[PDB]
Amino acid sequence: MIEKAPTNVEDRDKAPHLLLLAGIQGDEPGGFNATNLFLMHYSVLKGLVEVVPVLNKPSMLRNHRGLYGDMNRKFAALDKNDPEYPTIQEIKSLIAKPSIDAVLHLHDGGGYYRPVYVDAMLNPKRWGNCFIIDQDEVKGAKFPNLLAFANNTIESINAHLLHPIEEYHLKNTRTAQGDTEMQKALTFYAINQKKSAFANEASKELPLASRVFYHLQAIEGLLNQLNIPFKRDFDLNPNSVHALINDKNLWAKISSLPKMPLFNLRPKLNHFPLPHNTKIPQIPIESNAYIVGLVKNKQEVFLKYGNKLMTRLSPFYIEFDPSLEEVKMQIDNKDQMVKIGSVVEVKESFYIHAMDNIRANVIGFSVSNENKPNEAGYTIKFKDFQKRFSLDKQERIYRIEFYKNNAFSGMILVKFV
Numbered sequence: 001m002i003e004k005a006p007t008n009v010e011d012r013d014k015a016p017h018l019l020l021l022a023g024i025q026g027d028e029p030g031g032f033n034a035t036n037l038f039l040m041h042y043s044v045l046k047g048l049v050e051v052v053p054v055l056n057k058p059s060m061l062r063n064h065r066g067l068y069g070d071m072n073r074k075f076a077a078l079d080k081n082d083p084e085y086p087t088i089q090e091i092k093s094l095i096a097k098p099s100i101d102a103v104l105h106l107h108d109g110g111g112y113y114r115p116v117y118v119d120a121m122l123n124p125k126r127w128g129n130c131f132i133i134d135q136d137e138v139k140g141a142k143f144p145n146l147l148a149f150a151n152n153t154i155e156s157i158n159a160h161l162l163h164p165i166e167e168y169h170l171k172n173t174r175t176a177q178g179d180t181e182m183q184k185a186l187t188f189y190a191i192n193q194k195k196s197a198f199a200n201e202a203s204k205e206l207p208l209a210s211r212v213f214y215h216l217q218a219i220e221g222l223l224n225q226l227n228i229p230f231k232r233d234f235d236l237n238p239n240s241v242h243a244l245i246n247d248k249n250l251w252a253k254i255s256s257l258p259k260m261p262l263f264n265l266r267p268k269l270n271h272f273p274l275p276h277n278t279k280i281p282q283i284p285i286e287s288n289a290y291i292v293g294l295v296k297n298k299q300e301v302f303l304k305y306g307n308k309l310m311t312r313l314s315p316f317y318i319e320f321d322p323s324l325e326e327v328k329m330q331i332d333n334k335d336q337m338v339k340i341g342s343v344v345e346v347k348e349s350f351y352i353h354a355m356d357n358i359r360a361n362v363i364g365f366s367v368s369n370e371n372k373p374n375e376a377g378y379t380i381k382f383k384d385f386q387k388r389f390s391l392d393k394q395e396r397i398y399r400i401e402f403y404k405n406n407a408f409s410g411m412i413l414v415k416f417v
Ligand SMILES: N[C@H](CCC[C@H](N)C(=O)O)C(=O)O
Pocket: 072, 105, 107, 108, 109, 127, 132, 182, 185, 186, 187, 198, 199
């Protein structure tokens, strides 16, 4: 759970409080790319929006809906030995908090919903491009009139239509009065705790940038009805949405290793160091996005950005000695100290100074065939590199690794501008 709040605490009580959820199935990327882009490029000026950007992370990592069955069918009867029993108990705690007024759950669904039959793709049994409620009202809620909030939200979405077929409509499922599937579902538990709950569906038949465009129009619409004010730093059209999701300024950081670009990496990275006696889900990880992770696949380890594969790691396990903090280096004529885990920019040349009990291996450069080398003490230029060992496709980024006895001591990266 991540909060999105005003930079000054005084404003938190000044507007209502929304709970925003997505990723309860791992194969619905419109939903969790939208929660991600909201977290990165928007600001909430009054009130609060709490976000769980992906509820079932093990499944998002395996591009699979469910893994332990459906998570959106486990809010009623549930055996105490079920594997996700602890996780739904926590989600139930989040919904039931006093300070939460409203809930929005984001989905991607098949076809295009219509309130009457038209053909196989367009009918009341489909889920795509609609906005959803359990009941027309909820006696006891702060905002009890579900039906009106929905209709004004839909009006807003339709003023910005790309093409005529994507038009939005309302869908009421009348949950308390018949169908037993929605009785086991998330929003029905939420109205039983007297909260106003909603769902948005975008059609699985659209390219990713269009699905996200509509998930963002829906959020922008609902926040307007609740009077939670906001600001974004970009123009909302499909071309601009495509350019923020595929942004060349995105990064990820594994354990104590340095920051790496997300896009334009090589497909496979070899002899990549990782800590021993530590199961893969326990290895720390960081990014300027909220949907990044690691997952074990036979012998390799995969780096994921939502459902996109960004590179395959071929690892090797070794103790991580934390003793070494910094290293001395010359860059474009000037001597300086550089901390373990940095990135540095070079126009012409660099040089590494030697150390006690520490060994250094510049990956892509070599001076002999001895397989545990020490390449401290050489003046090195761009033309001295074997370009195939670069970390990127543009052939400008290279690794430097440090060792002591049988232990890994740290990494640094160089970038040729
Ligand atoms: N395709 C979805 C519809 C979303 C239902 C909504 N009430 C929620 O789960 O919050 C499903 O079959 O569950």
